[PDB]
Structures are given as C-alpha cells and as structure tokens.
Amino acid sequence: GSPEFLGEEDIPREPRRIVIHRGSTGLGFNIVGTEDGEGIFISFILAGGPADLSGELRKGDQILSVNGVDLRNASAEQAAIALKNAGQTVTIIAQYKPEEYSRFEANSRVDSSGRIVTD
C-alpha cells in the first residue's frame, strides 16, 4: 500500500564477506586511505564493473582484508598492490563506516538514515 523504501532501513554495520570476480580490467572500484593507515575505504563503484555486479559493496565500506591479508592499517598504495595481486577471485571483508568515510570526501556528511550525502 504505502510504499516500503529501502532508504528508510538501516544499512547493516556488521562485517560481511564479498567475493568479487576480476574483469578484463580490474575490480571496478576505487579506494581512499592515508600513509598512516587509518583505513581503506571504497570511494567509487564503477557501474557494470565486478564490484557493482556483486551487489554487495558500496561507497563508504571499509576494506578490512583482501584474501585474508589485513588492510586495516595499510596505505592506499599498499591496498592497491594487494588488490592488484589478489588474483581472479577476490575475497573481501568489508564493513560499512560512513562517518569515517565522510571525513575523506569534501562536503560530505552522513544523514539520519546512515546514508552518505554530498552537498
């Protein structure tokens, strides 16, 4: 009757396992991080790329590990090398951390429903 919007439902904050299958051109997402290793976050998912095709990753996810390699304290450069080298079947542990992510993206913030919005 009244429509049931997904946007009015909380995005799960618990860690998840996601398997991504490499395309001809990589995994179809970009990351941001720091040289001190304060987290690796998905900043962008390419429409139609492997990450998108999984249906299980979003901007603001922190990549905790790749194929069992702990990336919680890695630089973006280290993370990029790990992801490159991860082979054709890539097992990611991710966790949605929009507040932490929002500190990286200019003019962004987290709304009442836990979504990242940019002004």
From Swiss-Prot:
Post-translational modifications: Palmitoylated. Palmitoylation is required for targeting to postsynaptic density, plasma membrane and synapses. Palmitoylation by ZDHHC2 occurs when the synaptic activity decreases and induces DLG4 synaptic clustering. Palmitoylation by ZDHHC15 regulates trafficking to the postsynaptic density and function in synaptogenesis. Palmitoylation may play a role in glutamate receptor GRIA1 synapse clustering. Depalmitoylated by ABHD17A and ABHD17B and to a lesser extent by ABHD17C, ABHD12, ABHD13, LYPLA1 and LYPLA2. Ubiquitinated by MDM2 in response to NMDA receptor activation, leading to proteasome-mediated degradation of DLG4 which is required for AMPA receptor endocytosis.
Localization terms from the record: Cell membrane; Postsynaptic density; Synapse; Cytoplasm
UniProt tissue specificity: Expressed in brain (at protein level). Detected in juxtaparanodal zones in the central nervous system and at nerve terminal plexuses of basket cells in the cerebellum. Expressed in cerebrum. Expressed in hippocampal neurons (at protein level). Isoform 1 and isoform 2: highly expressed in cerebellum, cortex, hippocampus, and corpus striatum.
Domain of life: Eukaryota
The PDZ domain, residue ranges: 17-97
Entry remark concerning the domains of this protein: The PDZ domain 3 mediates interaction with ADR1B.
Function: Postsynaptic scaffolding protein that plays a critical role in synaptogenesis and synaptic plasticity by providing a platform for the postsynaptic clustering of crucial synaptic proteins. Interacts with the cytoplasmic tail of NMDA receptor subunits and shaker-type potassium channels. Required for synaptic plasticity associated with NMDA receptor signaling. Overexpression or depletion of DLG4 changes the ratio of excitatory to inhibitory synapses in hippocampal neurons. May reduce the amplitude of ASIC3 acid-evoked currents by retaining the channel intracellularly.
Complexes and interactors: Interacts through its PDZ domains with ANO2 and NETO1. Interacts with KCNJ4. Interacts through its first two PDZ domains with GRIN2A, GRIN2B, GRIN2C and GRIN2D. Interacts with ERBB4. Interacts with KCNA1, KCNA2, KCNA3 and KCNA4. Interacts with LRRC4 and LRRC4B. Interacts with SYNGAP1. Interacts with ASIC3. Interacts with SEMA4C. Interacts with CXADR. Interacts with KCND2. Interacts (via first PDZ domain) with CRIPT. Interacts through its first PDZ domain with GRIK2 and KCNA4. Interacts through its second PDZ domain with the PDZ domain of NOS1 or the C-terminus of CAPON.
Family: Belongs to the MAGUK family.
The name this protein goes by in its record: Disks large homolog 4
Native species: Rattus norvegicus (Rat)
The encoding gene: Dlg4
